[PDB]
């Protein structure tokens, strides 16, 4: 949890500055759309009482964190597979290769994928992601938890995503850019440099979500 420490310090710092508790607030001056995430979670399915958590990333790949802490990942070609065991052992194969050891888990991934496809809305479909690297690994879901107000999704690339149940607003925090992308209730998205929010301030609603984000990151570090 090296990236989480950076994110905590970053969030602690912005909240301490009290960005909404100022007379002059100019959050537009803190916008940096050069910092849009490469990846975020566009769909999720919590079936952890039986199977685990399934999700979609913005690139159309899918994953499932099974209850046994194994992970299956379908790349956006809908065929290429990455299997990650508890100890970290990874395997690269295909749905069509038909490996008998994994058919139970592959079948489940298809159910998750189908449920998301025909039932659920794709978050940030109106956002173009940042390019990235052709060599870099596909991120996966490291860990997650739900509160009564939000789901918290921590990816292996260090990004933390928080979705709020009440009003559909979402936060995407990247510690590498020290940046936050905010999707409001009207589905508008803005990316802010956190250090610039300390100087220019932001509206009341973003500030309170940055306050909540910090609590959640505390929970993440504190679960180790």
């Amino acid at each position: 949890d090296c990236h989480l420490s950076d994110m905590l310090q970053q969030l602690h710092s912005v909240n301490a500055s009290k960005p909404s508790e100022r007379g002059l607030v100019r959050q537009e001056e803190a916008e940096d759309p050069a910092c849009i995430p490469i990846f975020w979670v566009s769909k999720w399915v919590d079936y952890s009482d039986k199977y685990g958590l399934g999700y979609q990333l913005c690139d159309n790949s899918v994953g499932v964190l099974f209850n046994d802490s194994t992970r299956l990942i379908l790349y956006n070609d809908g065929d290429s597979l990455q299997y990650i065991e508890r100890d970290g052992t990874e395997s690269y194969l295909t749905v069509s290769s038909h490996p008998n050891s994994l058919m139970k888990k592959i079948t489940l991934l298809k159910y998750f994928r189908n449920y998301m496809s025909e039932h659920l809305l794709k978050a940030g479909a109106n956002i173009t992601p940042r390019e990235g690297d052709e060599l870099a690994r596909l991120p996966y879901l490291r860990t997650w938890f739900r509160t009564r107000s939000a789901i918290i999704l921590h990816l292996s690339n260090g990004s933390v995503q928080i979705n709020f149940f009440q009003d559909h607003t979402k936060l995407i925090l990247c510690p590498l850019m020290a940046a936050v992308t905010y999707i409001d209730e009207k589905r508008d998205f803005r990316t802010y440099r956190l250090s610039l929010l300390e100087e220019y301030g932001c509206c009341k609603e973003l500030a309170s979500r940055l306050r909540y984000a910090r609590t959640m990151v505390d929970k993440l570090l504190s679960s180790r």
Partner: peptide, 9 residues
């Protein structure tokens, strides 16, 4: 396949 919880349907 009826999951109890999920993102915005």
């Amino acid at each position: 396949f009826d999951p109890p919880l999920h993102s915005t349907a």
